[PDB]
Ligand binder design. Sequence first.
Ligand code: G04
Ligand code: CL
Ligand code: CL
Lengths: 99, 99
Amino acid sequence: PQITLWKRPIVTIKIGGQLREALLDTGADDTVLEDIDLPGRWKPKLIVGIGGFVKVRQYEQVPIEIAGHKVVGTVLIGPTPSNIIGRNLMTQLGATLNF
Amino acid sequence: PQITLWKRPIVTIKIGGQLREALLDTGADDTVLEDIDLPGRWKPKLIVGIGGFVKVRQYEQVPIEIAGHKVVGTVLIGPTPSNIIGRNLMTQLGATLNF
Ligand SMILES: COc1ccc(S(=O)(=O)N(CC(C)C)C[C@@H](O)[C@H](Cc2ccccc2)NC(=O)O[C@H]2CO[C@H]3OC[C@H](OC)[C@H]32)cc1
Ligand SMILES: [Cl-]
Ligand SMILES: [Cl-]
């Protein structure tokens, strides 16, 4: 699909059998979700944003479906005001910005 | 231009006669710059990010050049770890996400 930016570029995701919405976020290196359970081991990581720092759980090689497209990548679980899909996963979709 | 997202989508901006770089950020409703002087009146505003909140100055009808394209819009000045171009200005470029 092609998306204009008059509205937030929100897509449906499926992860660990859970359905959620997330923002396609070219400003995010990494993918960060709040409202989700993932199984298995994970590494503490700190990530910064406008308001400072957030402590997140790093989960590696997570299967995720983003607007129908199946990928495997790193997912961070932690407090975020919005679920965000970062460039780590958008590169798997072959996503481009056009102007 | 069309760009891919293997690297951060950073563009050159010119604002109030100052040259800077900024991230094209589909996850940002608003444009937030740290390292710049704008003249005239402005309004307190609080904006929420990953890590919480930053206090910013809202400047309206600011002339800005983004990768060669002249626009006028709202610019927030405040602490941000990265200068960001939000959808308020990317819609003025006719920017789209494609996958
Ligand atoms: C290395 O890994 C990451 C590091 C940082 C981030 S981030 O979320 O902090 N961020 C980085 C930017 C600030 C350099 C990505 C942004 O797209 C972020 C994504 C985002 C979206 C919503 C809430 C919080 C964060 N957006 C905003 O903070 O937007 C601000 C500014 O405009 C307003 O619109 C939305 C917010 O208002 C709600 C305001 C993500 C992954
Ligand atoms: Cl739109
Ligand atoms: Cl990844």
